[PDB]
Amino acid sequence: PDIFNRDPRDHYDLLQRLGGGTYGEVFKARDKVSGDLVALKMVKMEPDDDVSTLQKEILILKTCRHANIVAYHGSYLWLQKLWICMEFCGAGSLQDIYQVTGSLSELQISYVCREVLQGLAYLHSQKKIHRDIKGANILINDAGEVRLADFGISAQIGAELARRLEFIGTPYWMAPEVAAVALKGGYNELCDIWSLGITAIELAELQPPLFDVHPLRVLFLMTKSGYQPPRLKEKGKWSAAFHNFIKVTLTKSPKKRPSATKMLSHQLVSQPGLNRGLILDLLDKLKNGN
Amino acid sequence: PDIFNRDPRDHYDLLQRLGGGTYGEVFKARDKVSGDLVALKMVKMEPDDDVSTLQKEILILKTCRHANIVAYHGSYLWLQKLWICMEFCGAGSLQDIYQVTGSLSELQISYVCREVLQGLAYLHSQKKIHRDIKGANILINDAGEVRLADFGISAQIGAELARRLEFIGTPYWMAPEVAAVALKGGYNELCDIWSLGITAIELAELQPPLFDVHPLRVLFLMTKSGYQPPRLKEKGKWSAAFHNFIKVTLTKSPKKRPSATKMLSHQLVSQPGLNRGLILDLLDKLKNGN
């Protein structure tokens, strides 16, 4: 896959850290030669991470042509630190945008959901799971394309699972079923479908349900037997299709939750009038206001 | 249950913390009146905590009279902290002991296994799961009795989760199945039967299996398909019954792992001659070598 064995700072200059920690170590950078702006993500490499596996995963990312996946431009290995070069989105995430433009329109939310579903179906078709669908992780590039970042690499999943070990504690005494559950963490492809439903509410109300309750209490609320899937709080403001999209995506039982493929036949994401223009208006509103 | 809503510092002199963090906030203290030594566990309360659930949970521990459960002496609620008064064990945990005496004999381990099984049977009958069966959490009072601690109350569960929130992330977007797993769902009480089998090995070799391996790598191995349940290293050193005890307690599938009650019929734990005299000898060995 031709992963560079060079210090990426040999070719780029870091300008700005992105995400405030929510993205990890991700930087806005400038191609020294061409001056092009890119995003460099640094995935710390453990000695255990087999570079043979890395090469296979990077090849998959390099050959990706899906319009809803963040563009891969190359990668670097230097001092056991893997760097991935991708497109830089001046607009950033949808969270960066609606924090300025405000509530997104139903059609705009519909376009976003359709595009994210298309991307989710591509990831799921590779037996990948995103696990963190949310406004902060859906990116709008300068051309108005909705894209998800594909970080399906063992070194990244290993880092996430490294925090999961600090969460569950020491494993030496754990039963196999406890270790298996803790490892998977309940994450399954259809969990991205639920997360998208929540995101649609986030884009519609500028925050997810129960955001006014501190996390610990929400975890106990979510896991009550009678926990009910959230809904939009302003009925009249939205069509029956939007409400139904939420109802269907936010199915409590994973077995009965529809896949990304099936969801693409839903009225809200199949309706006429969904075109890139909707995002170009949003970008205009962000750059120039009212 | 009469949870005294007075300052417990008025009735006890705090002498020294216990456990070095593994037990949380625990203090060896003295009753200012009777002079008896006690163990106080300080649980951080949330301003949200439902006090009705707390009372219902303390009454159960108060009316507990099981010989294999640490006695409950009373509790205090003060300045957003729940203090639980219990008996104090001058010898500490089996871990604190075998780190000085060396490995235990098969007969001593058999006695510890029957008593722990007795305590587990009680907790499992209450729909409670210990989850932390290990030498560090098996206490030995001066009389040679083996006792498990019953901290099966919501305040403690929330207390421990609040400490681990930094390692799991925000929950607002998580699907129900993901939230359920993060809150220790997905397995049975039989996981304690496994943890005791590992503990039996721990008491005989001073270490759980694979202790010399990185906890992350261990987890991966346990989840691997062909994972072999651990066994005792030196076969000749132990009886056929002890080996079988390990074999059945370390059954891979939980659907086939016997219950605490069913294990109490195993030869190793139903053999005559098992009494606290075995531990009183270990405590003597702890006091003056040999």
Ligand SMILES: Cc1c(-c2cc3cc(NC(=O)O[C@H]4COC[C@@H]4C)ncc3c(N)c2F)cnc2c1NCCO2
């Ligand atoms: C989303 C993500 C990324 C990631 C962020 C990017 C941000 C931007 N742009 C941006 O942030 O712009 C704002 C700052 O300046 C103006 C805007 C307000 N561009 C490209 C990115 C890119 N390719 C990425 F892969 C990297 N790692 C991640 C995640 N999700 C969580 C798991 O780890």
Ligand SMILES: Cc1c(-c2cc3cc(NC(=O)O[C@H]4COC[C@@H]4C)ncc3c(N)c2F)cnc2c1NCCO2
């Ligand atoms: C085990 C536990 C406890 C707990 C510890 C106790 C320690 C001692 N004694 C002791 O440690 O003595 C040594 C240090 O000094 C001399 C000895 C070497 N006595 C009574 C205890 C008692 N009743 C407890 F409930 C409290 N919270 C816990 C756990 N397990 C993890 C979850 O939270």
Ligand code: NA
């Ligand atoms: Na062993």
